[PDB]
Design a protein around this ligand. Structure first.
Ligand code: HEM
Ligand code: HEM
Ligand code: HEM
Ligand code: HEM
Length: 107
């Protein structure tokens, strides 16, 4: 579809922004994150209206923006959900990839 963006993209819908780099995610297919919607992968921003636009962090339905980035019981893998699988039981990878503070997502 469109060309992937350069690294250094800041996701900043909340008070805890995170930088997302496509280059470090080259082993994952585009469509595993810009997931199919009605049979076609969608490339719009995750928080676009009508998409995951509920900014209530206690909302764990599919509309919750915090939920889609962090939770494990999801239909497509979230940021944290896939990272738990990648980090396994290695303390260094868990710190960098899944920690809530002092990790590569949240300083
Ligand atoms: C695969 C090479 C692939 C493509 C192509 C791609 C495209 C893409 C675009 C065009 C954007 C910008 C969207 C906008 O309107 O700002 C964008 C942004 C994000 N991407 Fe992506 N992307 C590809 C692959 C992947 C992979 C493998 C993941 C998941 C690991 C992923 C995730 C994201 C995220 C998150 C964003 C930011 C969205 C937001 O709401 O800010 N992309 N991508
Ligand atoms: C932006 C790259 C983006 C992410 C991240 C994302 C994640 C995501 C997850 C983890 C789920 C599962 C939720 C659960 O509780 O099981 C999920 C599901 C749906 N999504 Fe999504 N999503 C991103 C992008 C978009 C966009 C741009 C839209 C709006 C067109 C959208 C919509 C949906 C819908 C609909 C679902 C439900 C699944 C279904 O049955 O179709 N997402 N998303
Ligand atoms: C969800 C949008 C999401 C975010 C945010 C994210 C962040 C992230 C960081 C900060 C790193 C470290 C490298 C860097 O600074 O770019 C990293 C690395 C890996 N990720 Fe990730 N990631 C998000 C989503 C996902 C998803 C959905 C998957 C799996 C489906 C995934 C996987 C990976 C992998 C693999 C790595 C590299 C690990 C390594 O080389 O040690 N991420 N991600
Ligand atoms: C550890 C499990 C952990 C916690 C706790 C956590 C919390 C957190 C908060 C409070 C926010 C802001 C929510 C709001 O609406 O104010 C937030 C935002 C994002 N996070 Fe997070 N987070 C934890 C861990 C991780 C990890 C390991 C990553 C990267 C894989 C990650 C990612 C994200 C993303 C993306 C966002 C949204 C950024 C934005 O758009 O502002 N979190 N997190």
């Amino acid at each position: 579809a469109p060309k992937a963006p350069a690294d250094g993209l800041k996701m900043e819908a909340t008070k805890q922004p995170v930088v997302f780099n496509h280059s470090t995610h080259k082993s994952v297919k585009c469509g595993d994150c810009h997931h199919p919607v009605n049979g076609k992968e969608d490339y719009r921003k995750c928080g676009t209206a009508g998409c995951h636009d509920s900014m209530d962090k206690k909302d764990k339905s599919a509309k919750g923006y915090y939920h889609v980035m962090h939770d494990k019981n999801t239909k497509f893998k979230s940021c944290v959900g896939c990272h738990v699988e990648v980090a396994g039981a290695d303390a260094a990878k868990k710190k960098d990839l899944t920690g809530c503070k002092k990790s590569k997502c949240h300083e």
